[PDB]
Coordinates of C-alpha atoms in Angstrom, one line a residue:
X1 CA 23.3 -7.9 -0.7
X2 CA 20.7 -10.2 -2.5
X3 CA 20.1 -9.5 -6.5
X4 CA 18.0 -10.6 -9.3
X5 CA 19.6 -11.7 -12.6
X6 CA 17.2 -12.0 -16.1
X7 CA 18.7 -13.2 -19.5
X8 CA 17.5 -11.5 -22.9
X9 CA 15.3 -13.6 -24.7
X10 CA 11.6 -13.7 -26.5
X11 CA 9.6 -14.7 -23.3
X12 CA 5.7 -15.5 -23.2
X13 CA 3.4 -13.9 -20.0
X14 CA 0.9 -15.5 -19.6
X15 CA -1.4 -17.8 -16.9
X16 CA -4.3 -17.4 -14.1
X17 CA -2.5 -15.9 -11.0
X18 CA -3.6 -14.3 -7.5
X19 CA -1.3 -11.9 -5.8
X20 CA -0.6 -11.4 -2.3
X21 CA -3.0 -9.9 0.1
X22 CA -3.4 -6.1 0.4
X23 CA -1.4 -5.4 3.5
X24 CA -3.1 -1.9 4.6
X25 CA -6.4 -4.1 4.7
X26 CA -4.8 -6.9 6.3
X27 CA -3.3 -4.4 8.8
X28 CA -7.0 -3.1 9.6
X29 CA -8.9 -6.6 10.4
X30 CA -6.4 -7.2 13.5
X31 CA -7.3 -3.4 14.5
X32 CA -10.8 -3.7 14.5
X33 CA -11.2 -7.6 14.7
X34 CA -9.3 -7.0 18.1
X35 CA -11.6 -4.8 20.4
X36 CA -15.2 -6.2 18.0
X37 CA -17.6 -8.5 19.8
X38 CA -17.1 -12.2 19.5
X39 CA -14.5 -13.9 17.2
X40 CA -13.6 -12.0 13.6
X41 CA -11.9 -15.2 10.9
X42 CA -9.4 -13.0 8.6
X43 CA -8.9 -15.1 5.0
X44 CA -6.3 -13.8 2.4
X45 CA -4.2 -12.1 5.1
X46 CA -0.5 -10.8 4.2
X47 CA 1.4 -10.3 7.3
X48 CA 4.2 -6.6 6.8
X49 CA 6.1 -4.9 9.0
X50 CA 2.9 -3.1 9.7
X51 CA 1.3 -6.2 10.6
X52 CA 3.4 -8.0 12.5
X53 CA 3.8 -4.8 15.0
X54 CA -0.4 -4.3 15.6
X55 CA -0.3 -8.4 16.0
X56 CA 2.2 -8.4 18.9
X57 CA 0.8 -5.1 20.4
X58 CA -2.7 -6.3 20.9
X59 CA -1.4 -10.0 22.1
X60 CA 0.8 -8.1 24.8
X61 CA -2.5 -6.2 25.2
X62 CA -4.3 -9.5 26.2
X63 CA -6.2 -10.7 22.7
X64 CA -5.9 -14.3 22.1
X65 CA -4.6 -14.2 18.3
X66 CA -4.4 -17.6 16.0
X67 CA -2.1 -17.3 13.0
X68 CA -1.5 -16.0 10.8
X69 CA -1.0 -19.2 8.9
X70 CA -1.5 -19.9 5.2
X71 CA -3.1 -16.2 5.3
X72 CA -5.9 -17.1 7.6
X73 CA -6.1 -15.2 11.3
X74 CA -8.8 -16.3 14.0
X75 CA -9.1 -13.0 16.2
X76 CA -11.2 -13.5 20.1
X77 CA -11.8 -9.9 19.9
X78 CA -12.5 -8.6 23.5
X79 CA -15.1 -5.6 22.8
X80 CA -14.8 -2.3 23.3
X81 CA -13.5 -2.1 26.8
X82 CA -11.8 -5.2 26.6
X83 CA -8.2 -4.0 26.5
X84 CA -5.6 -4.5 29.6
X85 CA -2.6 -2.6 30.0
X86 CA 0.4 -3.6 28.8
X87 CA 3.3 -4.9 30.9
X88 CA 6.1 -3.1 29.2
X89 CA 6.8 -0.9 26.2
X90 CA 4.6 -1.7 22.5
X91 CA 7.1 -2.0 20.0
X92 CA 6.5 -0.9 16.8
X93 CA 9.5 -1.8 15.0
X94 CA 9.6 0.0 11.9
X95 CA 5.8 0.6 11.4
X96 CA 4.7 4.2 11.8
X97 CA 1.3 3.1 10.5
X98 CA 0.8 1.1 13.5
X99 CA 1.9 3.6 16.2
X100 CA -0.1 6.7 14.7
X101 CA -3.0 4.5 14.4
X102 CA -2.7 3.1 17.5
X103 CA -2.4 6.7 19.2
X104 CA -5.4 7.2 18.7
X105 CA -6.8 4.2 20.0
X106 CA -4.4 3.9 23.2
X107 CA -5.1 7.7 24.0
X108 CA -9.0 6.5 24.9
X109 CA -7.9 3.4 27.1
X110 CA -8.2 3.5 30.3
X111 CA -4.7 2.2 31.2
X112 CA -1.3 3.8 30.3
X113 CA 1.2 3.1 27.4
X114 CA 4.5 3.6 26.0
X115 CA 4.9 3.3 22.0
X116 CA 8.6 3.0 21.0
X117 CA 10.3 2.0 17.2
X118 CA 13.6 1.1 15.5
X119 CA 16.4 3.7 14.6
X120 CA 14.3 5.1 12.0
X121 CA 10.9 5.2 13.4
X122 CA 12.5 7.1 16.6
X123 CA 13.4 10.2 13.9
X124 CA 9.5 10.0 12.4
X125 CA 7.8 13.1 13.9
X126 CA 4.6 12.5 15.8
X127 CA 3.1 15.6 16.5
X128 CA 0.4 15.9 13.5
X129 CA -1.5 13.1 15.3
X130 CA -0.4 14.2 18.9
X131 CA -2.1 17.5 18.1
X132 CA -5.3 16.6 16.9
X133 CA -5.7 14.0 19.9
X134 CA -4.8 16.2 22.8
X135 CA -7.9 18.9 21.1
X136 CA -10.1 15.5 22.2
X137 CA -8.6 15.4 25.6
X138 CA -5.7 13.3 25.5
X139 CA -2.8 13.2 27.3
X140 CA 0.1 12.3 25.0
X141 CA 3.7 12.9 25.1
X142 CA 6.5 12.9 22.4
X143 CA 10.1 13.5 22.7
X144 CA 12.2 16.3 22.3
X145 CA 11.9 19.4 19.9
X146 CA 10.5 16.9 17.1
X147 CA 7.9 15.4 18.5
X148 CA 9.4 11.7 17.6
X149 CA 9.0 8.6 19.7
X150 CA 8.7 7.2 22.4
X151 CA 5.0 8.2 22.8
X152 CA 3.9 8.5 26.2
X153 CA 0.2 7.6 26.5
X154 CA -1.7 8.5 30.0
X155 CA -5.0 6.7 30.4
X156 CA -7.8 7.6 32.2
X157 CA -8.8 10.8 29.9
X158 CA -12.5 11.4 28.8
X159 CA -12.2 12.1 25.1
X160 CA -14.6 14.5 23.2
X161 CA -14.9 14.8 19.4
X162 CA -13.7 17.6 17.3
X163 CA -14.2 19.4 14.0
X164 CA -10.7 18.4 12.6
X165 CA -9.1 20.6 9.6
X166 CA -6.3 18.6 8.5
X167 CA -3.2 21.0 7.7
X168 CA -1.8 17.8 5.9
X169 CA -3.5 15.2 3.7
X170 CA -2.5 11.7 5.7
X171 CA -4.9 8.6 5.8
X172 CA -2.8 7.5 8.8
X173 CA -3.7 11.1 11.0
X174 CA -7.1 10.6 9.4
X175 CA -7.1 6.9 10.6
X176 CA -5.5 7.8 14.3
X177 CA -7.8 11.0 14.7
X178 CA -11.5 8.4 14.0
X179 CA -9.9 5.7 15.7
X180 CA -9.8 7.7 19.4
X181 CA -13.2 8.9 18.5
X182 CA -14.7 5.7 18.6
X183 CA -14.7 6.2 22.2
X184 CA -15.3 9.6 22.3
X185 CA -18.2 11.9 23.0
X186 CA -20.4 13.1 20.4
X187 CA -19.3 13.5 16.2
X188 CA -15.4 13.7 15.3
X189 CA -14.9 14.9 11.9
X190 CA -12.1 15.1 9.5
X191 CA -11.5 17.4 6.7
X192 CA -8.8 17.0 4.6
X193 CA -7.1 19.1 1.9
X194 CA -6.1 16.2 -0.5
X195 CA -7.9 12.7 -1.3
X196 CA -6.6 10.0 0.5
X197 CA -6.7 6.3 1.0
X198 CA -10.1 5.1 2.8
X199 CA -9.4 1.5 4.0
X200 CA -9.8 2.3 7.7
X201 CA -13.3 3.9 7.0
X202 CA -14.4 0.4 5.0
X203 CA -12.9 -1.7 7.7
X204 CA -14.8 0.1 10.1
X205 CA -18.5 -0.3 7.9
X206 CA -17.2 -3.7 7.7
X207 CA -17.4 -4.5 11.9
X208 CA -20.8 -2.2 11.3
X209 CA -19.7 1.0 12.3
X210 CA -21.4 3.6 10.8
X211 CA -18.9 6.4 9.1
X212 CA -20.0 9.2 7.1
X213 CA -18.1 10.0 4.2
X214 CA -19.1 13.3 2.9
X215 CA -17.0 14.7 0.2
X216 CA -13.3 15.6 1.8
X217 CA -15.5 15.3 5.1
X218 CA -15.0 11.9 6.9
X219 CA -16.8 11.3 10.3
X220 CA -18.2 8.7 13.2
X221 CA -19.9 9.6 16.0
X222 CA -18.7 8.2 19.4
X223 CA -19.9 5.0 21.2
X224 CA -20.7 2.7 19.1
X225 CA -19.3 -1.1 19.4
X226 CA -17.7 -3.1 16.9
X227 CA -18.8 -6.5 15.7
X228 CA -16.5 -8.8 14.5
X229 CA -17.1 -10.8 11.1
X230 CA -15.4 -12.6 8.6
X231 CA -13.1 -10.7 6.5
X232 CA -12.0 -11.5 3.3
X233 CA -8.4 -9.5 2.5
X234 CA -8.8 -8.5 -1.3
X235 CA -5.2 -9.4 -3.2
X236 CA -3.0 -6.2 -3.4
X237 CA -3.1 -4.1 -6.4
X238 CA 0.0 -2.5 -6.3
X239 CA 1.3 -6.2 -6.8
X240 CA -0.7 -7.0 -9.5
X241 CA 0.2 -3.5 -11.1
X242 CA 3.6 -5.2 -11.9
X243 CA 2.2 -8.5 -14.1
X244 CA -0.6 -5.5 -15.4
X245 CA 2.6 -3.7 -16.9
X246 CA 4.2 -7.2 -17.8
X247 CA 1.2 -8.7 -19.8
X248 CA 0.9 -5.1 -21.8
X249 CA 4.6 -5.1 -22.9
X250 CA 5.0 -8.7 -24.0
X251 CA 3.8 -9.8 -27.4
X252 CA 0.3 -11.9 -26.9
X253 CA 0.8 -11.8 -23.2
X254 CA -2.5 -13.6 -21.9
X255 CA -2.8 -12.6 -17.9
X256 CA -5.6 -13.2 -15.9
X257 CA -5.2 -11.7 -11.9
X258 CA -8.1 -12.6 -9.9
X259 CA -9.0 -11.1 -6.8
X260 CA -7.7 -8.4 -7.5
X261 CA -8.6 -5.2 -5.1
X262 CA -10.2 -2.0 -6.8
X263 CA -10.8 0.8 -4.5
X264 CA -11.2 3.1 -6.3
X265 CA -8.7 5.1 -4.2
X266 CA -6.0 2.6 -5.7
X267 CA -7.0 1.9 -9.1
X268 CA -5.2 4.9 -10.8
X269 CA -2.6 2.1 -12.1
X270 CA -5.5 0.6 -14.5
X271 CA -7.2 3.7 -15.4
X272 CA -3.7 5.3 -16.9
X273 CA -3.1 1.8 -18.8
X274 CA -6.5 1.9 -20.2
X275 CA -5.9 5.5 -20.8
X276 CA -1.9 4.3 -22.7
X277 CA -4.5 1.5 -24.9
X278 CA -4.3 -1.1 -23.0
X279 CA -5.9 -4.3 -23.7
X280 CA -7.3 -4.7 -19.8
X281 CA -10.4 -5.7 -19.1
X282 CA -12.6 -5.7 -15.6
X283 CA -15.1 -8.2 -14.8
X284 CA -16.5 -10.3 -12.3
X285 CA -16.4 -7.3 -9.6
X286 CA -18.2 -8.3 -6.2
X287 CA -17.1 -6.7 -2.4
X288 CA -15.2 -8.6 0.3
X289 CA -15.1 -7.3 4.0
X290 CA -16.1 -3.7 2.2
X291 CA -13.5 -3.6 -0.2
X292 CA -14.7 -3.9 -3.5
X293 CA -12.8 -6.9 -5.8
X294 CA -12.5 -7.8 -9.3
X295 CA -10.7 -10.1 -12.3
X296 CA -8.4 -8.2 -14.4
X297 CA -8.1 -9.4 -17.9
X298 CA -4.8 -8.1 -19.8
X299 CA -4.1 -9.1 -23.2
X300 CA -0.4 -8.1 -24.9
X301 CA -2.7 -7.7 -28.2
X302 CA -1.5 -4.3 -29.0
X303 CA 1.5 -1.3 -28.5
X304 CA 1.1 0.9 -25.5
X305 CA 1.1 4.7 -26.2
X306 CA 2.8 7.5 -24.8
X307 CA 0.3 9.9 -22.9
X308 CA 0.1 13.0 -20.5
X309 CA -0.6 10.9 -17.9
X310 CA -3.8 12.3 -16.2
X311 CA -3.4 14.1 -12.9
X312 CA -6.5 12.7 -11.0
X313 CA -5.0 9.6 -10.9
X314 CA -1.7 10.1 -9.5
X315 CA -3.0 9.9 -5.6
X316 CA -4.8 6.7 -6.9
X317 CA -1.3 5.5 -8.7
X318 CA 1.2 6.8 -6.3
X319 CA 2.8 3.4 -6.0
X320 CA 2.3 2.1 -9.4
X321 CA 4.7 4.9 -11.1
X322 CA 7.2 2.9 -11.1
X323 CA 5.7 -0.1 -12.9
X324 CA 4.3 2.3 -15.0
X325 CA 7.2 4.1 -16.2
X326 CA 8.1 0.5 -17.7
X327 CA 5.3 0.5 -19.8
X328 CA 6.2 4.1 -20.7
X329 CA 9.4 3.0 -22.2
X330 CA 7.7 0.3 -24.3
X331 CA 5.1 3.0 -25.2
X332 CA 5.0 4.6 -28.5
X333 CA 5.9 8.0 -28.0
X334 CA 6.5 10.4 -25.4
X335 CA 5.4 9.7 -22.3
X336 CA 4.9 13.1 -19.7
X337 CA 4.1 12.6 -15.8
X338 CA 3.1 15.8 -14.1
X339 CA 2.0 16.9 -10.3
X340 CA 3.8 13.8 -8.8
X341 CA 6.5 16.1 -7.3
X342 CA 5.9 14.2 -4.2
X343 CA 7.8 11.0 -5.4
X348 CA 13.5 7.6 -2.0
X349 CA 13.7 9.4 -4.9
X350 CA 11.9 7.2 -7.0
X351 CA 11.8 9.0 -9.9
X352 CA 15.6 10.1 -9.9
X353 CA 16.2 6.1 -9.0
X354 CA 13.9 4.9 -12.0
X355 CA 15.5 7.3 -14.8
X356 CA 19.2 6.1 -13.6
X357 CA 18.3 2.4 -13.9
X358 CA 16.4 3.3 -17.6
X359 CA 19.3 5.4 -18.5
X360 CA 21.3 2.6 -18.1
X361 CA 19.1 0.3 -20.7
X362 CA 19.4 3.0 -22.8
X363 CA 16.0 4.5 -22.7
X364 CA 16.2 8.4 -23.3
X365 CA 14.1 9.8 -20.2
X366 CA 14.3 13.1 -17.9
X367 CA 13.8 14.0 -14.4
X368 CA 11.2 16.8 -13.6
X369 CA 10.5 18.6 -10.6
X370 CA 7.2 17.5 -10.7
X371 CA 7.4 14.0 -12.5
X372 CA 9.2 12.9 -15.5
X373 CA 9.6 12.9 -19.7
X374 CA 10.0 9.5 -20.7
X375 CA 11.1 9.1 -24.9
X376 CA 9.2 5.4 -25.5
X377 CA 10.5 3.3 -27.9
X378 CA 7.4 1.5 -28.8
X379 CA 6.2 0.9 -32.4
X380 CA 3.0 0.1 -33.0
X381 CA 3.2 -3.6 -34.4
X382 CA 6.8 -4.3 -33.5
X383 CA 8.0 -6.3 -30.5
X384 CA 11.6 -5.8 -30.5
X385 CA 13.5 -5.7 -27.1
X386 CA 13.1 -2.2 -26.1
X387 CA 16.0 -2.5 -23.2
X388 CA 19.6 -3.1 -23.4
X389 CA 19.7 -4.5 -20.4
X390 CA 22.6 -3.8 -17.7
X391 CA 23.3 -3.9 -13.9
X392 CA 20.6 -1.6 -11.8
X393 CA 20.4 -0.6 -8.3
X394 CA 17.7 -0.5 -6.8
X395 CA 18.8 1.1 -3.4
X396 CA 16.6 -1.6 -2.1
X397 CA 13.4 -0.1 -3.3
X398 CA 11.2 -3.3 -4.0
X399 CA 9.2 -1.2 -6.6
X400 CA 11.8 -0.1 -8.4
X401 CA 13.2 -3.6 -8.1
X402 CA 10.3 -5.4 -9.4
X403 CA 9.6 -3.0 -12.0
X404 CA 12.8 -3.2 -14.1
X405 CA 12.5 -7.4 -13.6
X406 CA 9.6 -6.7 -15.5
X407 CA 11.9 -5.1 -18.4
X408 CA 13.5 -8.5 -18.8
X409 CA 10.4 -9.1 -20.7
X410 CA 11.9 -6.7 -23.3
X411 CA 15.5 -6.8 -23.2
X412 CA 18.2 -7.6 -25.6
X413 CA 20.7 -7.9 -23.2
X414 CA 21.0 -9.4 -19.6
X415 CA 19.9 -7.7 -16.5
X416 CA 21.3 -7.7 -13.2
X417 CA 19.3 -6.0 -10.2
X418 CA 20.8 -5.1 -6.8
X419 CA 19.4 -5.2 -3.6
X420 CA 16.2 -7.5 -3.9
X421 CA 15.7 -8.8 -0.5
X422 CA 13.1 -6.1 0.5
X423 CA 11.1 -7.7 -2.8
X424 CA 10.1 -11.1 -0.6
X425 CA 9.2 -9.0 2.1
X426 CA 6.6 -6.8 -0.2
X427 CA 5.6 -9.6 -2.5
X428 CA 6.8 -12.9 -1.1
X429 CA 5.3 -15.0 -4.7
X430 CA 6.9 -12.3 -7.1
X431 CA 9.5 -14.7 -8.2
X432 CA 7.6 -17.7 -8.2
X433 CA 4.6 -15.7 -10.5
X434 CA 7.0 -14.5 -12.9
X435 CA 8.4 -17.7 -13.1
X436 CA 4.8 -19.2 -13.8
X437 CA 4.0 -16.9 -16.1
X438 CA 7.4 -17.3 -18.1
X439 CA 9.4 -14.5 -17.1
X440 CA 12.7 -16.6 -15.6
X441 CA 14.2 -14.9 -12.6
X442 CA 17.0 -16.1 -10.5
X443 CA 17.8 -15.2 -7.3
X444 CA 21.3 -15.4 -5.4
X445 CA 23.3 -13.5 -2.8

């Protein structure tokens, strides 16, 4: 019942900010930093839903865990074998990440488990990653007709690898499918059908595990041991895609984000600005705990334009859409989205709140005409403001707080308090980069 309100106004954006951390990477050091030899420091760290749920799993599992505080986690990881059984039932809350991941992982222990969720994890459907596993040798149970949680894990098992055809593209099957063949015997190898996210495979090169990545073909081969390290979380890109977006709508914006993570299986975001003319540069690139990092420079010294937006990127920008479809409306020019028919109905949720600003826009099956109102030189409010829901979405709540930096009219935004949880600073950045936002329930 929380929202965000943002008066009309010329606003400057400008300022040397870091976002957040990424919380998939985050998610991965207390994976892997848990069963490595010795003692893995995680810096940068962003504790989720996702997060939270591995965290309490692998205490109850035995690992002695410090933090996280002020983003830094000390991890005694307890080597390969190191794991005891669990007194009761893991559970995962609300984080399907975690227990598909950790299938694969609890499926090779020697000791039993039980994985359980909230309401809505207990209707998620397990049996993509159940599959897969059992082919290796493990014994793992799921409930009723669906295949949803609890998971019932038995221990004991010897697990072999397998030659894995993915029916479905999913880094978290992917993820859950390697993950059991760290223990197993001989190669396990994924194939899949789509490109997908690859921050388990870095993580693992990261504790020195050696994983092949060959084309759509992703494999390990059985028996190795992790070794833990310090890991440096890269700052979260989708974050950062919002003050991108804000810096290339607002007249001599001046944003500098440092940090910020560019894997290049998330960096769709800046590759479709750059392709709209924005003024975004990236420099100073280096790696951190495998994940390649850079400064991004964006400069409001010029007016977006409308573009097909290009279909290789839309894996790579899945998130950013709607931060993007912001700019589009700022844009000069149409603005056409295609092959994103897998997007909460974000789309249908983004054109009802632009409809209400008054930007002309249509719902596709497959993504989405947007009519921009940009002209090239001119820096008039492109919004007319009004009151949006967000049906709690923090995307699509963050993304029209960024049209307050172009509205002639005030803007009132329900259902916000999933925002904190996704980007706790969000307010406070916007705030220090002159973009006023004010929060009540």
């Amino acid at each position: 019942t929380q929202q965000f309100s943002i008066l009309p106004g010329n606003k400057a954006f400008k300022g040397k900010f870091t976002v957040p951390g990424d919380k998939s990477v985050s998610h991965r050091s207390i994976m892997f930093g848990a069963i490595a030899e010795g003692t893995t420091h995680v810096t940068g760290f962003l504790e989720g839903e996702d997060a939270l749920a591995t965290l309490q799993a692998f205490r109850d599992m035995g690992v002695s865990i410090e933090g996280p505080k002020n983003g830094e986690v000390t991890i005694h990881g307890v080597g390969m074998h190191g794991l005891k059984a669990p007194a009761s039932a893991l559970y995962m809350g609300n984080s399907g990440t975690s227990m598909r991941l950790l299938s694969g992982m609890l499926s090779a222990q020697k000791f039993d488990s039980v994985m359980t969720g909230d309401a809505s994890l207990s209707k998620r459907p397990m049996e993509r990653i159940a599959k897969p596993l059992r082919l290796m040798g493990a014994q793992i149970q799921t409930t009723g007709e669906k295949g949803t949680p609890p998971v019932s894990i038995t221990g004991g098992q010897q697990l072999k690898g397998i030659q894995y055809d993915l029916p479905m593209a999913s880094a978290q099957v992917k993820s859950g499918i390697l993950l059991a063949g760290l223990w197993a015997e001989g190669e396990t190898s994924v194939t899949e059908p789509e490109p997908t996210r690859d921050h388990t495979e870095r993580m693992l090169r990261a504790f020195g595990y050696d994983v092949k990545t060959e084309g759509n073909k992703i494999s390990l081969v059985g028996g190795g041991k992790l070794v833990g390290t310090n890991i440096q979380v890269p700052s979260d890109i989708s974050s950062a895609a919002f003050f991108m977006v804000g810096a290339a709508i607002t007249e001599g914006a001046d944003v500098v984000l440092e940090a910020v993570g560019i894997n290049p299986t998330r960096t769709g975001v800046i590759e479709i600005l750059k392709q709209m003319g924005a003024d975004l540069t990236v420099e100073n690139e280096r790696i951190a705990g495998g994940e390649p990092i850079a400064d991004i420079h964006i400069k409001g010294s010029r007016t977006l334009k409308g573009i097909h937006m290009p279909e290789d990127q839309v894996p790579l920008a899945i998130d950013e859409f709607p931060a993007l479809f912001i700019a589009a409306a700022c844009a000069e020019g149409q603005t056409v989205l295609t092959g994103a028919a897998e997007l909460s109905d974000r789309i249908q949720v983004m054109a009802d709140g632009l409809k209400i600003m008054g930007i002309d826009c249509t719902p596709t099956e497959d993504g989405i005409i947007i009519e921009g109102k940009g002209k090239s030189g001119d820096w008039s409010p492109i919004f007319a403001g009004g009151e949006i829901e967000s049906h709690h979405d923090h995307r699509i709540a963050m993304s029209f707080s960024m049209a307050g930096l172009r509205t002639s009219g005030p803007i009132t935004i329900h259902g916000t308090e999933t925002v904190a949880t996704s980007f706790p600073t969000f307010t406070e950045l916007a705030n220090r980069a002159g973009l006023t936002i004010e929060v009540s329930q």
